[PDB]
Amino acid sequence: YVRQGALIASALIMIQQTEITCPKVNQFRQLYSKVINDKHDDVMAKFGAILAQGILDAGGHNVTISLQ
Amino acid sequence: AVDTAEQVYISSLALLKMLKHGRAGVPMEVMGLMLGEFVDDYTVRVIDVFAMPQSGTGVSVEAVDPVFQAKMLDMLKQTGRPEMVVGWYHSHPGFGCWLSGVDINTQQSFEALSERAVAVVVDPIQSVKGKVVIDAFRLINANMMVLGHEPRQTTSNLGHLNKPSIQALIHGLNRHYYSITINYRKNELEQKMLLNLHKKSWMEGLTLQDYSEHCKHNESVVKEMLELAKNYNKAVEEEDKMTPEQLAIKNVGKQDPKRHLEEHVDVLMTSNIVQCLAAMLDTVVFK
Amino acid sequence: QIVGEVLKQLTEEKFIVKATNGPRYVVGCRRQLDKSKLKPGTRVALDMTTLTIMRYLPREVDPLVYN
Amino acid sequence: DKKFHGILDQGEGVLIIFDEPPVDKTYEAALETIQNMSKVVDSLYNKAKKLT
Amino acid sequence: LREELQLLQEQGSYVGEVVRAMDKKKVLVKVHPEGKFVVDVDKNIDINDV
Amino acid sequence: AVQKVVVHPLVLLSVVDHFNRIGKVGNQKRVVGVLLGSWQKKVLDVSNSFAVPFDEDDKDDSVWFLDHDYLENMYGMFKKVNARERIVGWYHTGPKLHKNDIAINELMKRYCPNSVLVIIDVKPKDLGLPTEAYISVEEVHDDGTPTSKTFEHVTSEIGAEEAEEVGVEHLLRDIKDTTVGTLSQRITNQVHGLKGLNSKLLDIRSYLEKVATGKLPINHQIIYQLQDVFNLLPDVSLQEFVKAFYLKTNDQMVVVYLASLIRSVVALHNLINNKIANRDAEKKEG
Amino acid sequence: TRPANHRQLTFEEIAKSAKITVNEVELLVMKALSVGLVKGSIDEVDKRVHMTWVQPRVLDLQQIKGMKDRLEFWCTDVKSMEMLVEHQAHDILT
Amino acid sequence: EFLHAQEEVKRIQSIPLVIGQFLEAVDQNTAIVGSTTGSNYYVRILSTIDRELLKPNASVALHKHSNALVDVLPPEADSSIMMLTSDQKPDVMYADIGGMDIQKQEVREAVELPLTHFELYKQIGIDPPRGVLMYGPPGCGKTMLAKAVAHHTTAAFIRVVGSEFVQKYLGEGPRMVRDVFRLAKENAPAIIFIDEIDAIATKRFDAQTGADREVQRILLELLNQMDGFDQNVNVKVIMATNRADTLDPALLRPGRLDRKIEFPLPDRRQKRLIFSTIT
Ligand SMILES: Nc1ncnc2c1ncn2[C@@H]1O[C@H](COP(=O)(O)OP(=O)(O)O)[C@@H](O)[C@H]1O
């Protein structure tokens, strides 16, 4: 549950931003792709990974959730 | 056919009855039924539990005597508080969080009688110091597996700290439907009563004990720290000029600087000062 | 109680009691009994589950032939 | 030869016999610990690492 | 370390003298108390790792 | 007749819950039942509890009822499931004891010859007392005093039931009522020990003051017999500290040499090692 | 009356208390030890009798003010020292 | 809070332990142990106890239901009794023996290694003997040389007793050989004295009858231990036998056991000397 929470948080920080902000952006996106394609992970970890992918690609780099 | 992330509000006295009953009949695999009520589908609450002697036959439905159970229920209704039967408990010294074949059969009979009749495994011998095991599951029919299996419903709660044992996994139970989450009725007027009264040390902090065993204890302390003297000696001539961590990893000695740390010396110092302060406090009280 | 022998007294708190058929355990002693009553190499009884000394018993041997 | 526990007070023409308490060996043991835990370490270590 | 003590509460692991490494992730092994106990292979070690 | 009783941390919460569950409709404040257990070596212990609804009237304290058939059936079931358990006494809440206790004791003593009374404070948690024990002694109040009831308190101490340590640790898991954090924990031990000593001795002083005023009957015949020795015991003579000027002060000064210095030296060793590492890192980083 | 406050029961004090001779002091204190009045040490170089009593009796409940005052003196001393050590211990308890 | 947590997590129970002998520390956080009933099983070693008492083949303590490495028991002699430190005790000194010599010069040669002289074994270039087998009848006592010598030069003396050793504790037989060898290695002045080899311990002419294979395995581990000794310290090993014919060649061959001494019958002149000495 901490792993999936970290994945969701890393997706949330990475919404609406590309690799120009940090070179790790592409690394985390491919990390999300390989963990969502990895179906031998725990139920909770996979659930958070997919929610992380959804919030990251929310609307197709079109909408975002910001507190500012 | 709905079993969400269900939670059992088990009571402390139910725990005490469980441990007492198990401690009495450790090798007999004593049986009992968990007196609980389904206030709703998944927020099951158990306030009381009883102890029943396992008949000589062993794990049998007739061992739980029906007339005796009815008389016990009537006695609870007259004196105390009535409570339904929707569960059972069993000290299980043989192996862990799963059920034996006969336990599965009698739980199937209980499921036919009740609505769920949760299967609770409590190991009396494995619970020794910190870990008491109370795992509850449900038996399922063949239809649950042919439909969308893992009857665990759509929520992210029963996946929290859900680690079924290997023997539970290889058995149907704890694998048929789900593993039930446990909770303790730590309500106030009950929990504050327990912490205030049961674990009672209230005027026992005034003990003096200056030298009851402490003169020879100090002799032993000096001898132990003389061994620390040799150890911390040994360390200072080891002290090699090749990044001493490299020397230390391959030449661990568990010495005063490494493992017999300052914590132990602090324990000796605390013991001395505590006896000092107690003696001095009572000396100034002595007026 | 299971029957064992005092394989080693070890110390005042922990004792080595060996069952007659294999395993030996580092167990405690009965509260009422004392080390002078336990002694090394004397038959004792361990608790079946908690594995602690419960009572010490004398032993006998018999040739049982032409007696 | 420490076979007796007393002091000969010739001025008074007597010998004062005292019961020596021997439980005070913690004192000497503590001194030995002080000596063999401090001398062997502080001088050697902080003379080897003079510069810091 | 406490969990290791609890894992060890089931003897922890069991020593086995590996003999035959079958292709289907199967090792025959030998255990001193009893002897041979045919079992699967762990995930960290492949079939050829045996 | 028993020397003393020892209460387990096993029946106190059960009694309190029984009070709570049967007080929903019975607001008499008076919960009366039986405590079952065992008495083996002049030490009486309680292992099980049971509550019965119970109504009182202030008129001579003789209006009441119980379910004796159900209670006896309970006892038979409890003995059947565990033979060593036996009724060690009967308990009543409401520490302000009334007069029906003698009739209840007379009726229930057919189960236990040395009938005893137990009071459980469900709501009160005054200092640490969960319950109190009472022994029935009507064999003449004193040598030169008239007849009375005189229910005395047999000494009670909270026992240590086995296998409940796991459950209580899991239950609380928040306060950790153990010697953890030795220095601070013992400071707290000294703190509430002084609190308990001050509170109880203030209570004794208040009792002496109220005896002096004479508003309450004076049980002096045991009060001065027990407190005179307490007062006259010579713990105020300081010449034994003179004889033992080094009572432990030698151990105090060796600990100063060998705990505080040792902590200072090991801390010094850690700092100078860190300083060497930091200086080398700063010089050789580039 | 004196909780070891005057623990020096000299011969002159004994004479004031009992109007008895010097040789009878030995028998009187002997019988006192036998019955249980005083169980302390009996010297003769200074004739000091140590004070322990294990046979209490009526303490003139009209004069209970004396023991009440001594008990409240103990209460004040204990509370004062508890507050003093609290003052010395604010650096940990506050 | 973290000091409180650190001092709270340091409970480690460890009161109701059991004994199952350690085999060897393969690495850190991994190990292999052998319980009393056998059941050799790989375990995880906690960091609380380590090399300070983690000697390779010493009996250790394991938790009741967990078999986990918790403590290592220091003593080794009283694990299976089989005699103990007969040192520091004059029972029969040396010259007070009635048997005079028989030879006793090869025995003083055998005590040369306990009588220091390991330094003199080098430099001069000699190779001191390591084993001494005495294939004599109860004549000369055959243990008055080992009760003595051990006191002539202060050294530990162990009766071993071969007849007792062959028993149900055949699986623990290797472990007890390791323990007694460790007791010897602990005290460089120590001599092992084994008795009653001929009739029970590895007779070589009668076929293996049931537990005889177990005796052969126990002897094999004894050879393993005596070869692991390899003159590491100045401890000596002496077996006493009535007839060496049935003994196994592995012990009998040179390189493990060389000095064969026969202690004959009272030797009427020596017999009269024995009578005078005893009287
Ligand atoms: N001075 C002595 N010289 C020779 N033998 C002695 C002397 N004193 C005692 N003995 C005897 O030597 C015997 C040793 O016998 P034992 O150890 O059984 O023989 P083995 O070593 O061949 O088994 C003792 O029983 C003892 O009576």
From Swiss-Prot, chain B:
Modified residues (Phosphothreonine): 243
Expression sites (tissue/organ): Widely expressed. Highest levels in heart and skeletal muscle.
Organism: Homo sapiens (Human)
Sequence motif: JAMM motif, positions: 90-103
Protein name: 26S proteasome non-ATPase regulatory subunit 14
Quaternary structure note: Component of the 19S proteasome regulatory particle complex. The 26S proteasome consists of a 20S core particle (CP) and two 19S regulatory subunits (RP). The regulatory particle is made of a lid composed of 9 subunits including PSMD4, a base containing 6 ATPases and few additional components. Within the complex, PSMD4 interacts with subunit PSMD7 through their respective MPN domain. Interacts with TXNL1.
Functional description taken from the UniProt entry: Component of the 26S proteasome, a multiprotein complex involved in the ATP-dependent degradation of ubiquitinated proteins. This complex plays a key role in the maintenance of protein homeostasis by removing misfolded or damaged proteins, which could impair cellular functions, and by removing proteins whose functions are no longer required. Therefore, the proteasome participates in numerous cellular processes, including cell cycle progression, apoptosis, or DNA damage repair.
InterPro entries according to UniProt: JAMM/MPN+_dom, JAMM_MPN+_peptidase_M67A, MPN, RPN11_C
Originating gene: PSMD14
GO cellular component terms attached to this protein's record: cytosol; cytosolic proteasome complex; extracellular region; ficolin-1-rich granule lumen; nucleoplasm; nucleus; proteasome accessory complex; proteasome complex
UniProtKB/Swiss-Prot annotation, chain D:
Transmembrane segments: none
Cellular compartment(s): Nucleus; Cytoplasm, Cytosol
Post-translational modification: Phosphorylated by AMPK.
Induction behaviour: By FOXO4; expression in embryonic stem cells (ESCs) is mediated by FOXO4.
Tissue specificity statement from the Swiss-Prot or TrEMBL entry: Highly expressed in embryonic stem cells (ESCs). Expression decreases as ESCs differentiate.
Subunit structure: Component of the 19S proteasome regulatory particle complex. The 26S proteasome consists of a 20S core particle (CP) and two 19S regulatory subunits (RP). The regulatory particle is made of a lid composed of 9 subunits including PSMD11, a base containing 6 ATPases and few additional components.
The family this protein is said to belong to: Belongs to the proteasome subunit S9 family.
Protein task: Component of the 26S proteasome, a multiprotein complex involved in the ATP-dependent degradation of ubiquitinated proteins. This complex plays a key role in the maintenance of protein homeostasis by removing misfolded or damaged proteins, which could impair cellular functions, and by removing proteins whose functions are no longer required. Therefore, the proteasome participates in numerous cellular processes, including cell cycle progression, apoptosis, or DNA damage repair. In the complex, PSMD11 is required for proteasome assembly.
Protein name: 26S proteasome non-ATPase regulatory subunit 11
Gene name per UniProt: PSMD11
From Swiss-Prot, chain E:
Entire protein: shown range: 59 to 108 of 406
Domain of life: Eukaryota
Subunit field text: Component of the 19S proteasome regulatory particle complex. The 26S proteasome consists of a 20S core particle (CP) and two 19S regulatory subunits (RP). The regulatory particle is made of a lid composed of 9 subunits, a base containing 6 ATPases including PSMC5 and few additional components. Component of a complex with USP49 and RUVBL1. Interacts with PRPF19. Interacts with TRIM5. Interacts with NDC80. Interacts with PAAF1. Interacts, in vitro, with the thyroid hormone receptor (in a thyroid hormone T3-dependent manner) and with retinoid X receptor (RXR). Interacts with ERCC6.
Name of the coding gene: PSMC5
Organism: Homo sapiens
Chain's role: Component of the 26S proteasome, a multiprotein complex involved in the ATP-dependent degradation of ubiquitinated proteins. This complex plays a key role in the maintenance of protein homeostasis by removing misfolded or damaged proteins, which could impair cellular functions, and by removing proteins whose functions are no longer required. Therefore, the proteasome participates in numerous cellular processes, including cell cycle progression, apoptosis, or DNA damage repair.
Protein known as: 26S proteasome regulatory subunit 8
Family classification: Belongs to the AAA ATPase family.
Localization (cell): Cytoplasm; Nucleus
From Swiss-Prot, chain G:
Disulphides: none
Modified residues (N6-acetyllysine): 16
Role noted for this protein: Component of the 26S proteasome, a multiprotein complex involved in the ATP-dependent degradation of ubiquitinated proteins. This complex plays a key role in the maintenance of protein homeostasis by removing misfolded or damaged proteins, which could impair cellular functions, and by removing proteins whose functions are no longer required. Therefore, the proteasome participates in numerous cellular processes, including cell cycle progression, apoptosis, or DNA damage repair.
Subunit structure, interactors included: Component of the 19S proteasome regulatory particle complex. The 26S proteasome consists of a 20S core particle (CP) and two 19S regulatory subunits (RP). The regulatory particle is made of a lid composed of 9 subunits including PSMD13, a base containing 6 ATPases and few additional components.
Protein family: Belongs to the proteasome subunit S11 family.
Protein name: 26S proteasome non-ATPase regulatory subunit 13
Residues of the full protein shown: 283 to 376 of 376
